[PDB]
Write a protein that binds this ligand. Structure first.
Ligand SMILES: Cc1cc2nc3c(=O)[nH]c(=O)nc-3n(C[C@H](O)[C@H](O)[C@H](O)COP(=O)(O)OP(=O)(O)OC[C@H]3O[C@@H](n4cnc5c(N)ncnc54)[C@H](O)[C@@H]3O)c2cc1C
Length: 480
């Protein structure tokens, strides 16, 4: 097998169900498994917070360990990807570069530039899809060339298409005996960087740890506990876990239960929601912004950086909202309906700030930040597309009360409020100043007053949204 190959990890930080890396190994006599850490590229394409950096480095550490157990290695190269390739195609006499066929525009542009470099330097480029359950193009073709714009229509097209693609086999020590992974000269240059190399605090405090190994453990620990959700989203978004592998595992449980257990089928539905947004995002221009986006309602959101700042820094004065944003910032993950609460509050519900700004904050702070899922759900929660019950607005006081009447979640993440009686824990501004003194927390000093009046703001915003939907009837109809 002739090729000397670089495989470029970008997502796909796993060895199970990795069709591109498998294709690389089957076609090559020597291989260099590489992650290019390109700060200039990421600076131009992404917003990445400290917790996300920690999860990436942990996932790279684990990938290095798993490759090393098979007689190989991970090579982390720090630089601009074009210069890195010019240098290392020469150093390693490369004839093939492999990389996953990611759908993100910034990844597609990188891929286009790498293909152009291959035409110049003399390497072929091979890609396989490792991020989706289905061949997205097949879904588009069955729907006449355009993506389904409702989940119902999406499911109808999938029922014509059939089952998802199956995972490919695991990689083995024999693969790296047939296709050798040489230790390069100057190998200390290729170590996984440590947090201080990225100027981030050294200790990661997220209850999440990156990597394929922890992803697989968590997956199996969830199914055993089932005998709160999976908490697997960061592993799917980073590629530490294959959605095809998880889909098939759920099918295995359904089969062994003689088709009598529907909970695994419900969880398969969560991955179909992921696939829905990936499919729309892959075939919709300007998907992650409002202007020029053909399915997005055009809404003149306020430019009010101070409102955004208060929301982002958990200083809205609504404890339920600030507690969620605090868990997001400190841990990097929040429950689906917690995301509903704060996204509705920021956009159509209260602050009337663009969903694009909420998306960018979530991108920075979420371990599971995902181009397609995040944009799709932010359009949903702002009632810009997909969701149309705009007279229904989450109450930033009452919603948590049903869940957690005593406010234990609030007291955990906002300990300044920990001594407030539950009668005030969701609306501490209604306490008298003397009750505030007794709780040790003066509103406006230790914890802010509420930044809007929810009743007045949501009333305002309902009238604004109604004008939008009465005028842009055709746009709203696209996703209903
Ligand atoms: C405003 C907003 C922004 C969001 N941004 C993201 C994001 O950047 N990345 C992300 O992975 N999810 C995002 N979500 C979706 C959802 O909240 C998370 O997928 C889920 O909370 C992750 O927890 P889990 O793995 O326990 O989910 P589970 O319920 O265990 O679901 C299993 C998997 O299915 C997928 N999934 C579940 N719900 C959805 C959904 N509504 N849409 C798409 N895929 C779904 C995820 O890959 C998830 O890991 C967003 C939701 C909202 C409302």
């Amino acid at each position: 097998m002739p090729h000397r190959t670089i495989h470029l990890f970008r997502k796909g930080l796993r060895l199970h169900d990795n069709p591109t890396l498998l294709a690389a190994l089957e076609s090559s006599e020597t291989i260099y498994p590489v992650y290019v850490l390109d700060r200039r590229f990421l600076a131009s394409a992404m917003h990445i917070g400290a917790l996300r950096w920690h999860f990436l480095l942990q996932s790279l550490e684990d990938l290095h360990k798993n490759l090393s157990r098979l007689g190989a290695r991970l090579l982390v190269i720090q630089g601009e990807y074009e210069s890195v390739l010019r240098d290392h195609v020469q150093k390693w006499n490369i004839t093939q570069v492999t990389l996953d066929a990611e759908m993100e525009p910034f990844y597609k542009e990188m891929e286009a530039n790498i293909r152009r470099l291959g035409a110049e330097l003399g390497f072929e480029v091979l890609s396989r899809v490792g991020h989706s359950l289905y061949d997205t193009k097949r879904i588009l073709d069955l729907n006449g060339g355009s993506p389904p714009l409702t989940y119902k229509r999406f499911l109808h097209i999938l029922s014509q298409l059939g089952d998802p693609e199956v995972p490919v086999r695991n990689l083995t020590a024999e693969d790296f005996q047939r296709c050798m992974s040489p230790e390069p000269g100057l190998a200390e240059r290729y170590r996984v960087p440590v947090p201080a190399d990225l100027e981030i605090p050294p200790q990661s405090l997220s209850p999440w740890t990156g990597g394929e190994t922890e992803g697989l453990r968590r997956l199996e620990q969830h199914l055993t506990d089932q005998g709160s959700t999976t908490g697997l989203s960061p592993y799917f978004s980073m590629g530490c876990l294959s959605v095809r592998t998880f889909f098939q595992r759920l099918s295995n449980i359904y089969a062994q239960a003689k088709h009598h257990s529907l909970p695994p089928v419900s969880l398969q539905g969560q991955l179909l929601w992921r696939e829905f947004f990936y499919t729309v995002a892959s075939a919709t221009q300007n998907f992650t912004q409002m202007a020029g986006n053909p399915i997005c309602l055009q809404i003149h959101w306020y430019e009010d950086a101070e409102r955004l700042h208060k929301w982002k820094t958990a200083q809205t004065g609504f404890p339920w909202i600030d507690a969620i944003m605090t868990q997001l910032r400190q841990e990097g993950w929040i429950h689906h309906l917690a995301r509903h609460a704060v996204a509705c509050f920021l956009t159509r519900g209260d602050l009337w700030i663009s969903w694009e700004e909420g998306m960018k904050v979530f991108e920075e702070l979420l371990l599971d930040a995902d181009y397609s899922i995040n944009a799709g759900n932010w359009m949903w929660l702002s009632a810009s597309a997909f969701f149309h019950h705009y007279t229904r607005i989450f109450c930033p006081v009452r919603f948590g009360k049903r869940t957690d009447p005593e406010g234990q979640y609030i007291r955990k993440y906002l300990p300044v409020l920990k001594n407030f009686p539950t009668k005030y824990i969701y609306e501490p501004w209604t306490a008298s100043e003397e009750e505030q003194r007794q709780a040790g927390c003066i509103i406006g000093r230790d914890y802010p007053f509420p930044m809007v009046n929810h009743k007045e703001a949501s009333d305002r915003n309902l009238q604004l949204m109604r004008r939008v939907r009465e005028e842009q009837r055709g746009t709203a109809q696209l996703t209903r």
